[PDB]
């Protein structure tokens, strides 16, 4: 029926999210300006956007109940592996099926397939990413479920390099049970039909998107002219 | 693999 602890967890995550995801997107003005013509014209802007987003995901992760109990090394492994996935997940909030784009408050900060494809990454990444956004949007998750999914994504014991996988697993299960119980007690059918299973599938979809993003990143890292336009944080998190 | 900025943001 959702223990006091589980309600506690959900409250913590909702707050953590509100403190790390600003729906006014007021900080986007600090990013190097977007350029829509477009040979890699969107790379500078989106590089800053992603770098900024990485910082926000780290802020969120640190507030996840139990994350603080992990070692510095394990925290780093988890963030490095989940960053792009959580970024793709949190972005579902600005994504709109009306015109298949991420509407971040204004024309200049509204990104579609043509914009997102001007940063060195191909449709081999973008097409599946857009499909993912649609599938996730169609789940019509409660914000409670959205934040739980992001936290579950971050605290994954099977990430390469994890040391105390047992501690990680325990922390994740606590989150996974909170999710399974919230769906049962707070998400009325039919919208709840196999919802947990579908949410877990999205975690699988994100692994695939992550793998493809990594593949293309490596390729691009072989070209200094592009790597030159990224940020130090991106270079560090994604590989240098 | 020594992640200075990440480590700093986590602490
Ligand atoms: C604008 C969107 C977020 C909206 C929000 O926060 O509400 C973000 C989240 C998912 C991001 C894509 C991730 C993969 C690629 C990374 C590369 O470093 C640059 C291109 C790449 C294609 C990104 C583009 C910008 C996206 C679509």
Six token digits for residue A184 = 């049962």
Six token digits for residue A24 = 């006014």
Question: Measured at the alpha carbon of residue A29, what is the angle toward residues A24 and A32, in degrees to the nearest 5?
Answer: 140
Six token digits for residue B1 = 């693999």
Q: How far is the CA of A53 from the centre of ligand 1 (A)?
A: 9
- Of the candidates A58, A232, A233, the beta carbon closest to that of B10 is on A58
Residue A8: φ, ψ to 5° = -60, -50
How determined?
Answer: X-ray
Report which of A180, A46, A25 is spatially closest to residue A93, judged by C-alpha positions: A25
Separation between Cα atoms, residue A134 and residue A71, nearest integer Å: 36
DSSP letters along A170-208, please?
HHHHHHHHHHHHHHHHHS-SSTTTTHHHHHHHHHHHHHH
- Which ligand 1 atom is the nearest neighbour of the CA of A47? 18
Tell me the CATH number at A8: 1.10.565.10
Whats the size of chain B, residue-wise?
11
Q: Are A218 and A210 in contact (CB under 8 A)?
A: no
- A75–B contact, CB cutoff 8 A: yes
The set of residues, in sequence order, having a beta carbon less than 8 Å from that of A144 and lying 6+ positions away, is: A10, A13, A14, A182, A186
Contact residues on chain B for A72, CB-CB shorter than 8 A: 7, 10-11
Number of domains making up chain A: 1
Q: What is the DSSP letter of B9?
A: H
DSSP letters along A24-43, please?
T-GGGGGSPPP----TTTTH
Q: How far is the CA of A3 from the centre of ligand 1 (A)?
A: 36
CA distance, residue B8 to nearest chain A CA (Å): 10
- A19–B contact, CB cutoff 8 A: no
Q: How far is the CA of A13 from the centre of ligand 1 (A)?
A: 22
Q: Are A64 and A151 in contact (CB under 8 A)?
A: yes
Separation between Cα atoms, residue A103 and residue A115, nearest integer Å: 12
- Which ligand 1 atom is the nearest neighbour of the CA of A53? 6
Element (H, E) at A23: none
Q: Do B10 and A79 touch (CB under 8 A)?
A: yes
Q: What is the resolution of this structure in A?
A: 1.9
Q: How far is the CA of A182 from the centre of ligand 1 (A)?
A: 29
3-state secondary structure of A216: helix
Cα A150 to the chain's mean position, in Å?
A: 7
Q: Are A21 and A56 in contact (CB under 8 A)?
A: yes
The parent domain of residue A198 ranges over: 1-240
- Which ligand 1 atom is the nearest neighbour of the CA of A21? 6
Cα separation values, A13 from A38, A49, A53, A90, B3, Å: 39, 23, 17, 13, 26
Which of A25, A27, A46, A47 gets mutated to test ligand 1 (max ligand atoms within 8 A of its CB)? A46
Report which of A212, A85, A228 is spatially closest to residue A154, judged by C-alpha positions: A85
Atom 6 of ligand 1, residue of closest alpha carbon? A91
Six token digits for residue A146 = 């959205």
Q: Are A35 and A114 in contact (CB under 8 A)?
A: no
CA distance, residue A140 to nearest chain B CA (Å): 32
> The dihedral of CA A33, A38, A42, A44: what is its sign?
negative
């Amino acid at each position: 029926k959702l223990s006091e602890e589980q309600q506690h967890i959900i409250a913590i995550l909702l707050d953590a999210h509100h403190k790390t995801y600003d729906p006014t997107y007021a900080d986007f003005r600090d990013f190097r300006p977007p350029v829509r013509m477009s040979p890699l014209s969107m790379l500078p802007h989106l590089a800053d956007l992603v770098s900024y987003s990485i910082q926000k995901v780290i802020g969120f992760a640190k507030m996840i109940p139990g994350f603080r109990d992990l070692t510095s090394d394990d925290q780093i492994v988890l963030l490095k592996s989940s960053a792009i996935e959580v970024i793709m997940l949190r972005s579902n909030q600005s994504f709109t099926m009306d015109d298949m784009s991420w509407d971040c408050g204004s024309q200049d900060y509204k990104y579609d397939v043509t914009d997102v494809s001007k940063a060195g990454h191909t449709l081999e990444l973008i097409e599946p990413l857009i499909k993912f956004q649609v599938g996730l949007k169609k789940l019509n998750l409660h914000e409670e479920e959205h934040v739980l999914l992001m936290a579950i994504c971050i605290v994954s014991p099977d990430r390469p390099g994890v040391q105390d996988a047992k501690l990680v697993e325990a922390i994740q299960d606590r989150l996974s049970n909170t999710l399974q119980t919230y769906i049962r007690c707070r998400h009325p059918p039919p919208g709840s039909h196999q919802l947990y299973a579908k949410m877990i599938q999205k975690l699988a979809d994100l692994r695939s998107l992550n793998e493809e993003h990594s593949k293309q990143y490596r390729s691009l890292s072989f070209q200094p002219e592009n790597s030159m336009k990224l940020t130090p944080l991106v270079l560090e998190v994604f590989g240098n | 693999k020594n992640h200075p900025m990440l480590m700093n943001l986590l602490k």
